[PDB]
Structure 1
């Protein structure tokens, strides 16, 4: 089997991407944030504290003839940005782009943090990291991809995120018309539960490529590109007037600037992020100071190849017995 679904930016800055997902019988379609950095499929629901729902579409398990409460199961997750959610668990039928999994764990939120409430466009998350990170207790549950992968034509999914435009998540096949050149594959460590890999280096604009190992994670659920402070300082030094602002929480730059590209290495291959992918717009409405899309990872503990990086590539998440990642230009 295969599936193919369009993913759409939630706003004009590409702050996140949402993908429609059918849950239950009859189908209830929710728009979920596909997140290769986590491993829970959780949704706003009829069980979510009413004051914490503000415009989201909810899953109502009592209206699904295939929903079954997973007895005794609870979940609770906290994300790297400080947001969180928790609740109980159903199993139900879940379909993405024509690919159907029966008995998928659907984690129904009883509580969500304010950042989720305040984002009316995101109805939940669909985790695509390794199932070892799933938070369901006392019996850990499998991700949608883990449940589907034996049925797929090939045990892979691909992320093709757009810049200020829709893109595609495919399951089970590699669309050879969706990229240019070849796909370069690179080794993955699953020891932390992530799609963790080592970039071979970087360049700023037309500058010389610096060969240096940068261990990080491919994370579709993180907006920005978080890299070591040395790398980030080298990038922003090429933008007149850019500075790290402690009050804002990262590098900012004059909105009148023209940003240089940023290149990262995948083996001997090179992925070029155009400068305008690095512009996240005014820090507050009407400001002429703009927020940068490349930020230091120093306070995180891990480097993160988030959407800023991934949207410059066609990315293969190869879930073979030994997982690998692939990157192509597009």
Structure 2
């Protein structure tokens, strides 16, 4: 079987992407943030503290005839940005773009951090990293992808994120009309539970390509591109007036500047991020200082190929017994 669903940016800056997901019987449709950097499927629900819900669509397990409470199970997650949520666990039927999994663990939020409350457009997360990172206790639960794997035509999913535009998540098949050229595959390490891979280098604008190994994770759940301080310094040095701002928390640049492109290596192939993708707009309304889409990973501890990088490519998440990542231009 296969599934295919349209994913849509939540605002004019592509801060995140939401994808409709059908949960329960009869279907309750929630718009979830597909996150290859985490492994929990959790949703705003009728159990969420009422003051922490502000416009989100909630899952109501009592109205689903297929929902079953998972006795004694709880969950608690903290994300790298300081966000967190926690609650109890149901199992229920979950469908993505026609692809149905029965008995999927649906984690019901009882408490969420303020960053989720203030994001009215995101009803939850759908984790797509490896199941070893799932936070359900005492019995760890499998991701949607892991549960669907056996029934998929091919054990893959693909991410085709749009620049200021809708895109597609496909499960079980590779749409050969969605990219140009060939797909270049590269090795994945699962030792930390992430889709972790090694980029072969980078170039700034039309500059010389620098061969250098950059270990990082492919994370649809993170907005920006987080790279080592040396790389990020070389990029912003080519932008007149750009500087690292402690009060803002990263590199900013005069909004009148034109940004150079950024190239990253995948084996012998090259993925080019257009400079316009790196502009995240004024730091505050009316400001002439703009926030950069490439930032240092030094404070984070890991390099992150977030949406800024992934939306420049067609990305194959190959969940075969030896997993690989595929990148193609589009």
1:77-110 per-position Cα deviation (integer Å, ceiling 9, x unaligned): 0000000000000000000000000000000000
CA separation in 2, counterparts of 1:269 and 1:262?
14
CA separation in 1, counterparts of 2:113 and 2:313?
32
**How big is the shift at 1:24?**
0.1
CA separation in 2, counterparts of 1:154 and 1:35?
20
Q: Structure 1 regions of 5+ residues with no counterpart? A: none
**How big is the shift at 1:115?**
0.3
1:210-241 per-position Cα deviation (integer Å, ceiling 9, x unaligned): 00000000000000000000000000000000
CA separation in 2, counterparts of 1:167 and 1:175?
13
Q: Which residue of 2 aligns with 1:290?
A: 290
1:258-283 per-position Cα deviation (integer Å, ceiling 9, x unaligned): 00000000000000000000000000
TM-score normalised per structure 1: 1.00
CA separation in 2, counterparts of 1:209 and 1:179?
23
1:163-206 per-position Cα deviation (integer Å, ceiling 9, x unaligned): 00000000000000000000000000000000000000000000
**How big is the shift at 1:309?**
0.1
Aligned length: 330
**How big is the shift at 1:65?**
0.2
CA separation in 1, counterparts of 2:270 and 2:150?
32
Q: Structure 2 regions of 5+ residues with no counterpart? A: none
CA separation in 2, counterparts of 1:148 and 1:207?
44
**How big is the shift at 1:294?**
0.1
CA separation in 1, counterparts of 2:224 and 2:159?
16
**How big is the shift at 1:50?**
0.0
Kindly report structure 1 stretches of 4+ aligned residues shifted beyond 2 Å: none
SS at match of 2:51: helix
Q: Is 2:77 the counterpart of 1:59?
A: no
Q: Which residue of 2 aligns with 1:137?
A: 137
SS at match of 1:230: helix
